[PDB]
Amino acid sequence: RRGALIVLEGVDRAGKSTQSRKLVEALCAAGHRAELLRFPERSTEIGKLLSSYLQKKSDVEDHSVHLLFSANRWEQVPLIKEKLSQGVTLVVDRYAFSGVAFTGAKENFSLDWCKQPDVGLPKPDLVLFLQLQLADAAKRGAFGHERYENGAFQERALRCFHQLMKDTTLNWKMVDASKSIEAVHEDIRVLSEDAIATATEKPLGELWK
Amino acid sequence: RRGALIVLEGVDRAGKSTQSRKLVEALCAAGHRAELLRFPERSTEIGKLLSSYLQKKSDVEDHSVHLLFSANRWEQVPLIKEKLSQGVTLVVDRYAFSGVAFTGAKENFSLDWCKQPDVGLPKPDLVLFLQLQLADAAKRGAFGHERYENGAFQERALRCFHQLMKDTTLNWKMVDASKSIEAVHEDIRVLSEDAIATATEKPLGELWK
Numbered sequence: 001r002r003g004a005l006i007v008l009e010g011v012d013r014a015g016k017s018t019q020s021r022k023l024v025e026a027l028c029a030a031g032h033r034a035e036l037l038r039f040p041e042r043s044t045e046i047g048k049l050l051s052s053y054l055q056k057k058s059d060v061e062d063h064s065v066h067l068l069f070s071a072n073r074w075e076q077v078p079l080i081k082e083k084l085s086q087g088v089t090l091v092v093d094r095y096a097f098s099g100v101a102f103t104g105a106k107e108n109f110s111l112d113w114c115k116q117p118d119v120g121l122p123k124p125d126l127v128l129f130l131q132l133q134l135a136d137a138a139k140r141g142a143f144g145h146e147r148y149e150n151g152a153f154q155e156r157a158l159r160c161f162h163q164l165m166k167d168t169t170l171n172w173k174m175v176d177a178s179k180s181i182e183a184v185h186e187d188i189r190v191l192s193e194d195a196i197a198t199a200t201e202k203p204l205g206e207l208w209k
Numbered sequence: 210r211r212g213a214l215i216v217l218e219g220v221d222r223a224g225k226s227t228q229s230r231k232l233v234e235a236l237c238a239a240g241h242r243a244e245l246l247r248f249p250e251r252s253t254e255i256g257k258l259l260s261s262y263l264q265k266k267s268d269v270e271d272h273s274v275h276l277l278f279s280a281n282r283w284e285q286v287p288l289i290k291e292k293l294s295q296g297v298t299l300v301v302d303r304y305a306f307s308g309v310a311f312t313g314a315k316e317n318f319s320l321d322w323c324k325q326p327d328v329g330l331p332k333p334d335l336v337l338f339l340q341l342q343l344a345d346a347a348k349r350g351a352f353g354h355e356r357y358e359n360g361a362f363q364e365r366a367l368r369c370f371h372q373l374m375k376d377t378t379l380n381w382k383m384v385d386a387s388k389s390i391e392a393v394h395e396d397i398r399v400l401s402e403d404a405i406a407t408a409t410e411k412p413l414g415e416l417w418k
């Protein structure tokens with residue numbers, strides 16, 4: 001009885017990391033086997049390169065950094081498949097959607113080019129998109145100092161995310177992340193419980209193919 | 210007056226490295242500005258990861274290692290473009306063709322998936338393919354100990370190379386690499402002199418797009 005693959009995507013400070021952490025806690029407390037994953041996974045050799053880039057400690061050519069971001073996902077595929085096959089549900093803070101939206105926001109990068117490197121990855125059974133108005137997000141303190149943390153770029157990435165949500169091959173669910181931490185959590189949790197039950201009667205799919 | 214981008218591809222021990230070295234020497238001696246590049250370029254952070262993999266010092270997931278091999282090309286694109294624009298001809302020992310043929314030889318990797326990461330790279334003005342019969346190649350000592358150095362794999366990669374040569378968007382030239390070092394060199398050199406003159410009246414192209 002395989003686990004589900006649940007990905008959390010969304011606007012800056014919408015609460016991806018907070019709701020991913022809380023969801024795995026809630027699932028486990030409800031007797032599911034569940035574990036948390038995040039992308040980029042900064043602990044591998046490729047992950048370190050990406051971390052240094054996001055911190056402006058190094059500069060990486062745009063195409064190369066996009067392929068590293070996808071290679072960082074592929075290096076976890078054997079683990080992902082093994083865990084799901086063992087019945088472990090995986091909650092993932094960012095996935096290939098962030099990869100296409102962040103590079104796709106840069107000048108001269110088509111959405112088709114950006115998607116290719118991730119074609120074939122495990123397909124999520126559920127892709128939550130945490131929505132939030134900037135007036136609301138701004139009250140979530142201030143922009144960080146990492147790369148991409150400015151409003152003009154974030155707004156181009158959102159545009160790309162909206163192009164990705166047109167793809168009906170995927171189970172997108174919008175979440176109103178303007179509510180309190182606990183109210184957004186409850187919305188997410190119920191969607192997740194439904195996906196772990198049903199979504200899983202079908203074999204794990206392949207993304208964008 | 211831009212330089213030309215000349216790539217050398219070919220079967221194992223066909224003489225890519227030897228003919229690339231000799232060609233840049235010959236061009237320079239004939240008053241051209243020319244420089245040698247090779248892929249993988251093992252000196253970068255990504256290059257080190259690839260080198261360790263090819264030496265069996267580390268194991269890398271197939272998809273991830275293919276994307277690193279393409280990221281290794283993209284990190285040299287700013288240099289490549291700068292050099293060609295300055296009138297420097299670049300001779301390249303292996304390029305994206307080796308990347309698609311080597312991964313494309315593994316089970317379950319389409320040629321289309323394999324090409325995508327390199328779509329957009331600078332397009333070579335001339336792609337020499339050094340051909341050699343194994344009876345002849347075998348007399349070129351023995352297989353190395355790096356990954357992919359066995360006859361069954363090499364034969365699957367050759368198959369992929371032959372699919373790539375069907376692509377007429379590219380200036381493929383076959384070279385009979387069974388001749389002596391100097392005779393193969395002379396063939397290569399004359400093809401290269403023709404490409405540097407003519408091929409260059411047109412702007413640098415984009416690969417596979």
Ligand SMILES: Nc1ncnc2c1ncn2[C@@H]1O[C@H](COP(=O)(O)OP(=O)(O)O)[C@@H](O)[C@H]1O
Pocket residue numbers: 010011012013014015016017018019140177178179180181184
């Ligand atoms: N629903 C929410 N309401 C108010 N603050 C929130 C909410 N969710 C997260 N926060 C706070 O906003 C900040 C960003 O949340 P985080 O989960 O890191 O976002 P993301 O990973 O999407 O950038 C953190 O300080 C977090 O505690």
Ligand SMILES: Nc1ncnc2c1ncn2[C@@H]1O[C@H](COP(=O)(O)OP(=O)(O)O)[C@@H](O)[C@H]1O
Pocket residue numbers: 219220221222223224225226227228349386387388389390393
């Ligand atoms: N035309 C040739 N005839 C005989 N030996 C050759 C020829 N070209 C290369 N060699 C030898 O064969 C070996 C492989 O050549 P090399 O250029 O390293 O090949 P590749 O880079 O294609 O593996 C080297 O020992 C080289 O000196």
Ligand SMILES: Cc1cn([C@H]2CC[C@@H](COP(=O)(O)O)O2)c(=O)[nH]c1=O
Pocket residue numbers: 039040054069070094095096098099100102103148
């Ligand atoms: C997974 C991934 C992410 N990104 C960016 C988005 C924000 C930053 C991570 O930071 P936080 O998750 O801490 O916001 O990294 C990319 O550009 N490409 C990708 O493939």
Ligand SMILES: Cc1cn([C@H]2CC[C@@H](COP(=O)(O)O)O2)c(=O)[nH]c1=O
Pocket residue numbers: 248249263278279303304305307308309311312357
């Ligand atoms: C450029 C490139 C090369 N390769 C392999 C082919 C042989 C080995 C290099 O070794 P030699 O060039 O020393 O033969 O690396 C790939 O698998 N993918 C690629 O993108």
Ligand SMILES: [Mg+2]
Pocket residue numbers: 016017018093
């Ligand atoms: Mg976060």
Ligand SMILES: [Mg+2]
Pocket residue numbers: none
């Ligand atoms: Mg396509």
Ligand SMILES: [Mg+2]
Pocket residue numbers: 225226227302
């Ligand atoms: Mg060589």
